[PDB]
Amino acid sequence: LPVRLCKEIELFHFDIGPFENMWPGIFVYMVHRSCGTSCFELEKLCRFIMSVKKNYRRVPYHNWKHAVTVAHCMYAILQNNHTLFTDLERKGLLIACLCHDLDHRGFSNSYLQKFDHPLAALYSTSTMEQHHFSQTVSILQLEGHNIFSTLSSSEYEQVLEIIRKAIIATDLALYFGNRKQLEEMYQTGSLNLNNQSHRDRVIGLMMTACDLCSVTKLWPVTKLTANDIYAEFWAEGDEMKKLGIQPIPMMDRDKKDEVPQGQLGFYNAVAIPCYTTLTQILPPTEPLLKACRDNLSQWEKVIRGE
Amino acid sequence: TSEEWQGLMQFTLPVRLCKEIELFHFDIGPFENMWPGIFVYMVHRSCGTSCFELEKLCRFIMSVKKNYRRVPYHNWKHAVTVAHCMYAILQNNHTLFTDLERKGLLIACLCHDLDHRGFSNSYLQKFDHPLAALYSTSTMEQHHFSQTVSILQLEGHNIFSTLSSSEYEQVLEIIRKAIIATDLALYFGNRKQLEEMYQTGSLNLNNQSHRDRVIGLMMTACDLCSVTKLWPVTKLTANDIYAEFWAEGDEMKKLGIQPIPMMDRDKKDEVPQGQLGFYNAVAIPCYTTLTQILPPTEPLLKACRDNLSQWEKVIRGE
Ligand SMILES: CNc1cc(-c2cccnc2Oc2ccc(Nc3nc4ccc(F)c(F)c4[nH]3)cc2)ccn1
Ligand SMILES: CNc1cc(-c2cccnc2Oc2ccc(Nc3nc4ccc(F)c(F)c4[nH]3)cc2)ccn1
Ligand SMILES: [Zn+2]
Ligand SMILES: [Zn+2]
Ligand SMILES: [Zn+2]
Ligand SMILES: [Zn+2]
């Protein structure tokens, strides 16, 4: 890995760059540094990464780049709270992040439900997410893709459960209740990492934090990333109008000029609470929150027209 | 029901102590009959008001008090002070520790110098004291745990009587290990091992042996906390530490042995150097490593560093 990369990949606000064919290397480097060189047989891990790459789609935002970007955010959390995590979590969380939007079409669970898509009948709740985990399992069962083959049966069931819960937690609908419970557990001191269900919840929050990490980048990356977010959402809003459903203003390209107030509302309602609470629980994740605020400042500055 | 009347109640300190006992550099003050209350409070906030049966807990504390001796440093005040530091470490890392570990660690700290006579393991060995024949390493520390177990065996004194046998044994191990770890001789090996494990990333709190080591370093850090207090307190506490050591040096001379300069009253003027050496060689690396493993314990390092500054100021003569 190049000098600049080695240094800057430790920073929370690292951008993985425009060279797609370095991203596998970057991910492998992150597994090595946060899990270990002997965590995975290198050959199987490359075949697995490439097969995952292949089942991500050429969509504006929810693509291979976002999959690797999210995994990096996870990496930086792992490295800055490294004593906290089991060897199983050191193995399965980065993988969970890399697989967490497998085969995303660029469409919400709402759209899938309104369209009456087969996945909506097959998975009634967190529809895309149950699908991302189903894709993950089936890639794992391809000959030579069981990167967990040396684990015991028990250890294999456990890490898949980590991957499952982690991926499900990326459904933004579950985030609100989850963060409420965690807030109230931290204020009252009941929160405890020796309690599996509390540990699950924190991982869930770590995953929301990683999924939304584009708001913790420096302003130029965050602004440019917003073009990609909205390109998807506007395409979905287009498809809503074709069904004959007025889409919400978030996904309606005719409301472009209201994007700045749109972002502001979201940093206040969702992103700031998310990272604020995560910073309470894992203080060394503060740089994420700090960046989020700087970007919240930049949207107000945009709204003022300066 | 008593578990029920104890659930309604919460213990209350004066306003100044409520606020400042949360601070790492808090001093427990000169009022001895306040310290039990101080301890019970810390137990209630870091553990919960149903961890111990209050009557049993008071009986236990009075017995522990009665088994500390009237020596200048390793006395009842020291015990409670060490327990406080552990309380602050617990409160600032609240999501890390089990209920048992919280129960047991505060109790361990309070009991960790039980029946200390003001003499090092080294003096006991040279004196040929009976304890040295019985415990050939960490002599005093095994005795401290031994006394602890004896207090718990007294009628109406088993504060862990409500635990399952399984949990009782776990807490007694947490306490045994913790107390043994205050043998400063074992600290150097322990810290070195943790510094390596932290730097390579192998350090993992879900592994019992690693966790034991961290707990060990936590115990060292609390044991030496006198160096993390504000300057006026560290300077004054220093009198008490040297009163002890000098008296040991006196007893070594009585055996016809030259005591090391650290325990030799004839070398009063080299104390500033001596402390400079100790901060450089022991205290700074201890809290440096602890702050590394547990970032919220930093204020201990910051304060340790400020006192190192004060000792240099004395050496220069300023
Ligand atoms: C909603 N879940 C989600 C969010 C993001 C996301 C991550 C980081 C930043 N933004 C993200 O998406 C959002 C985009 C817009 C909004 N809110 C919003 N935009 C508006 C534009 C016009 C308008 F009139 C509005 F009312 C808008 N509201 C929120 C998240 C990505 C994927 N899924
Ligand atoms: C060593 N074990 C120990 C130390 C302390 C302790 C805690 C905080 C501060 N000091 C402590 O004890 C020490 C006292 C002195 C030294 N070093 C030292 N002092 C000297 C004075 C004169 C002289 F000539 C010297 F060489 C000295 N060396 C270290 C710890 C408490 C309990 N056990
Ligand atoms: Zn998703
Ligand atoms: Zn996502
Ligand atoms: Zn001791
Ligand atoms: Zn002690």
DSSP string, A187-236: HTT---TTSHHHHHHHHHHHHHHHHTGGGGS-HHHHHHHHHHHHHHHHHH
Q: Counting beta carbons within 10 angstroms of the beta carbon of residue B221, is it exposed (0 to 12), middle (13 to 18) or buried (19 or more)?
A: buried
Best of B10, B47, B95 to mutate (most A CBs within 10 Å, chain A):
B95
* Binding annotation of A: 62, 66, 100-101, 211, 263
Write out the two tokens for A26: 């970057």
Instruction: Provide the total of helices (H) and of strands (E) in chain B, helices listed first.
Output: 16, 0
Kindly report the backbone phi and psi dihedral angles of residue B48, in degrees, each rounded to the nearest multiple of 5, phi listed first: 130, 155
Write out the two tokens for A125: 């709740």
What single DSSP character describes residue B22? T
CATH superfamily membership of A1-306? 3'5'-cyclic nucleotide phosphodiesterase, catalytic domain (1.10.1300.10)
The protein residue with its alpha carbon nearest to ligand 2, atom 24, reads B261
Which CATH code for domain B1-318? Answer: 1.10.1300.10
B44 is in an annotated binding site: no
H-run or E-run covering B58: helix B54-66
Give the number of the ligand closest to the Cα of residue B265. 2
User: B179: CA distance to ligand 3 center in Å?
Assistant: 49
Output the CA torsion sign for A22, A27, A33, A37: negative
User: A59: CA distance to ligand 2 center in Å?
Assistant: 67
Is the CB of residue B171 less than 8 Å from the CB of residue B47?
Answer: no
Q: From CA B248, how far away is CA B118, in angstroms rounded?
A: 8
Instruction: Name the 3-class secondary structure at B302.
Output: helix
- The angle subtended at Cα A258 by Cα A255 and Cα A263, nearest 5°, is 120
Q: How is B31-55 classified by DSSP, letter by letter? A: -GGGHHHHHHHHHHHHT-TTSS-HH
Tell me the shortest Cα–Cα distance from A284 to chain B, in angstroms.
8
Is the CB of residue B301 less than 8 Å from the CB of residue B221?
Answer: no
Which of A282, A112, A149, A139 has its CA nearest to residue A209?
Answer: A282
Write out the two tokens for A115: 């369209």
B203 near A CB under 8 A: yes
Q: Which residues of A touch B208 (CB under 8 A)?
A: none
Catalytic residue (one of A62, A72, A132, A145): A62
Q: How is chain A classified by DSSP, letter by letter? A: --HHHHHHTTSTT----S-GGGHHHHHHHHHHHHT-GGGS-HHHHHHHHHHHHHHS---SSSSHHHHHHHHHHHHHHHHHTGGG--HHHHHHHHHHHHHTTTT--S--HHHHHHHT-HHHHH-SSSHHHHHHHHHHHHHHTSTT--TTTTS-HHHHHHHHHHHHHHHHTTSHHHHHHHHHHHHHHHHTT---TTSHHHHHHHHHHHHHHHHTGGGGS-HHHHHHHHHHHHHHHHHHHHHHHHHT-PPPGGG-GGGGGGHHHHHHHHIIIIIHHHHHHHHHHSGGGHHHHHHHHHHHHHHHHHHTT-
Q: From CA A162, how far away is CA A196, in angstroms rounded?
A: 11
Kindly report the backbone phi and psi dihedral angles of residue A182, in degrees, each rounded to the nearest multiple of 5, phi listed first: -65, -40
Output the CA torsion sign for B33, B38, B41, B47: negative
Q: Cα A191 to chain center, whole Å?
A: 24
Write out the two tokens for B79: 């015990």
Is the CB of residue B206 less than 8 Å from the CB of residue A86?
Answer: yes
What lies within 8 Å, CB to CB, of B184 at 6+ separation is B220, B223, B282
> Which residue type occupies B252?
M
Overall size of chain B counted in residues: 318
- The angle subtended at Cα A42 by Cα A36 and Cα A46, nearest 5°, is 120
Solved how? X-ray
Write out the two tokens for B251: 């007893």
Q: Is the CB of A262 under 6 A from ligand 1?
A: yes
Nearest 10 degrees: Cα torsion A72, A76, A78, A79: 130
| CB-CB under 8 Å, A281 with B203 | no
B12: left (phi over 0), alpha (psi -120 to 50) or beta: beta
Overall size of chain A counted in residues: 306
Q: From CA A166, how far away is CA A202, in angstroms rounded?
A: 10
Write out the two tokens for B256: 């016809």
Is the CB of residue A12 less than 8 Å from the CB of residue A288?
Answer: yes
Specify whether B74 is catalytic: yes
Q: From CA A249, how far away is CA B177, in angstroms rounded?
A: 62
Residue of A170, A207, A266 best suited for mutating to test ligand 1, as the one with most atoms within 8 Å of CB: A266
Residue that is written with structure tokens 């160096």 in the block: B227
Q: From CA A33, how far away is CA A75, in angstroms rounded?
A: 9
- The angle subtended at Cα B149 by Cα B143 and Cα B177, nearest 5°, is 65
Nearest 10 degrees: Cα torsion A31, A34, A37, A40: -50
Q: From CA B155, how far away is CA B153, in angstroms rounded?
A: 6
Q: Which residues of B touch A86 (CB under 8 A)?
A: 204, 206
Residue that is written with structure tokens 């699908």 in the block: A131
Q: From CA B295, how far away is CA B93, in angstroms rounded?
A: 9
Residue that is written with structure tokens 């269900």 in the block: A197
> Which residue type occupies A131?
H
Is the CB of residue B247 less than 8 Å from the CB of residue B118?
Answer: yes
| CB-CB under 8 Å, A281 with B295 | no
Is the CB of residue B25 less than 8 Å from the CB of residue B230?
Answer: yes
Which of B241, B283, B248, B280 has its CA nearest to residue B263?
Answer: B248
Is the CB of residue A65 less than 8 Å from the CB of residue A131?
Answer: no
Kindly report the backbone phi and psi dihedral angles of residue A121, in degrees, each rounded to the nearest multiple of 5, phi listed first: -75, -35
Q: Which residues of A touch B295 (CB under 8 A)?
A: 283-284
Instruction: Name the 3-class secondary structure at B112.
Output: coil
Q: Which residue on chain A is closest to B208 by alpha carbon?
A: A86
Q: Is the CB of A255 under 6 A from ligand 1?
A: yes
Catalytic residue (one of B25, B74, B116, B144): B74
User: A275: CA distance to ligand 3 center in Å?
Assistant: 18
Q: Which residue on chain A is closest to B90 by alpha carbon?
A: A189
The total of other beta-carbon atoms located within 10 Å of residue B69's CB is: 13
- Listed resolution, Å: 2.6
Write out the two tokens for A229: 């977010």
CA atoms within 13 A on the CB side of A176: 5
Kindly report the backbone phi and psi dihedral angles of residue A295, in degrees, each rounded to the nearest multiple of 5, phi listed first: -70, -35
Residue of B123, B241, B244, B280 best suited for mutating to test ligand 2, as the one with most atoms within 8 Å of CB: B241
CA atoms within 13 A on the CB side of B299: 13
Is the CB of residue A114 less than 8 Å from the CB of residue A241?
Answer: no
The protein residue with its alpha carbon nearest to ligand 2, atom 6, reads B224
Residue among A34, A87, A281 minimizing CB distance to B95: A281
A123: left (phi over 0), alpha (psi -120 to 50) or beta: beta
Give Rg (Cα) of chain A.
19
Give Rg (Cα) of chain B.
20
B205 near A CB under 8 A: yes
Write out the two tokens for B304: 């340790």
Interface of A with B in 246-275 (CB under 8 A): none
